[PDB]
Symmetry: C2
Subunit: 166 residues, 2 copies
C-alpha cells in the first residue's frame, strides 16, 4: 500500500517518525505531505522531508492516511485541499490513523458525526461537538478509524493500525 501522512512544522516528532518507520518496515510505501515540499521540523527539533505539497495529492491517490499530532494539525486543518483529501479517504473507508491533536483535521473534514474515538483529552470537547463519542483509551478502533491519545500509546496505536494495512 501507499500510506499518506499529513503534517507540518510543529508535529509531535515521535508521532510522525515512529509510524513512518513502522509502516515502511512492513513493506508499505510512505509519503509525507505538507504545505510545500522541503523539510518540516518537529516540536523536539527533528527534521522530516516533505514528499508532496497538499495541492499535488489526489483525494483518491493513496490507500491509507495517518494524522500525527503536535501543533501541526491546527494549521493543516486550515488547508482546504488537506481536509478534502481527509474527508474523501475517511468516507471511502480507507484506513485512517490519528493520534493526539490529529483529529482536529478530522473535525475540519466534517466526518466525525456518529463516530467513536479518542484524542488528547485537551480536545475531547471539540471531538464531542463534532458529533463523535469520545472515550479515554490507549487505542480505539471504530471501523476504519484507529485513534490514540499521546506518544505513550504508540505501541497500541500501531499494533491496531497495522492490522488494517494487511
Amino acid at each position: 500500500m501507499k500510506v499518506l501522512f499529513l503534517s507540518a512544522d510543529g508535529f509531535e516528532d515521535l508521532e510522525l517518525i515512529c509510524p513512518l518507520h513502522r509502516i515502511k518496515e512492513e513493506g508499505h510505501e510512505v509519503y509525507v505531505a505538507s504545505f510545500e515540499r522541503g523539510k518540516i521540523t518537529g516540536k523536539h527539533g527533528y527534521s522530516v522531508n516533505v514528499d508532496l505539497a497538499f495541492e499535488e495529492v489526489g483525494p483518491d491517490e493513496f490507500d491509507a492516511l495517518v494524522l500525527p499530532g503536535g501543533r501541526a494539525p491546527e494549521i493543516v486543518r486550515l488547508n482546504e485541499k488537506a481536509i478534502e483529501i481527509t474527508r474523501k479517504m475517511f468516507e471511502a473507508g480507507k484506513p485512517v490513523a490519528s493520534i493526539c491533536h490529529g483529529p482536529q483535521i478530522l473535525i475540519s473534514a466534517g466526518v466525525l458525526k456518529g463516530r467513536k474515538g479518542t484524542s488528547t483529552i485537551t480536545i475531547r470537547d471539540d471531538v464531542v461537538n463534532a458529533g463523535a463519542e469520545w472515550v479515554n483509551e490507549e487505542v480505539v478502533v471504530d471501523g476504519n478509524w484507529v485513534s490514540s491519545r499521546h506518544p505513550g500509546d504508540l505501541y497500541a496505536w500501531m499494533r491496531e493500525f497495522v492490522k488494517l494495512l494487511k
Copy 2:
C-alpha cells in the same frame, strides 16, 4: 520474550523510543535499565522512565538486548555491570541490536573480535580496533548481532531484529 534496553541521559530519542514501542507492539515486555531508577532525558528532550538500575539486572535475566545510540553509550560503557550483562547476553547468542554509538558498549564488553557490523562512521575506527569488520550498511546481521547506523535506518534495523525475536 523480555527485551532489555540499556541507556542513560543523552540517548538518541528515536533510537530508544521507536524500538521500545515496536517491540511492545509485538506483545513482548520491554525494560529500560540505566544507572538508577527515575527518568532519563534524550538529546532532543524526551523523557523515558528507567525501570531498573543496572545492578538489579541479572546477566542471564532477559532474552534480548537493545543498545540505542546518542551520548549515552559513552557513559553506559563505564558501568561494570552493564558491560557484564552485555557480554553475557551477546556471548550467549541472544539477539542484540545496536545502532549509531550503541557499539561502544560492545567494544567495552570485549565481544567484537571476529564480528562484523556497522555503527555511526564516527566510531568506525574504534570498532575496527576492537577487532570487528566494519561495513557501511543500513543494517547488518552477524549471527545474533543486528547493527544499524542512524535514525534513518530504523525501519530496516527493526525489520531484521524482530525476525530474531520470533
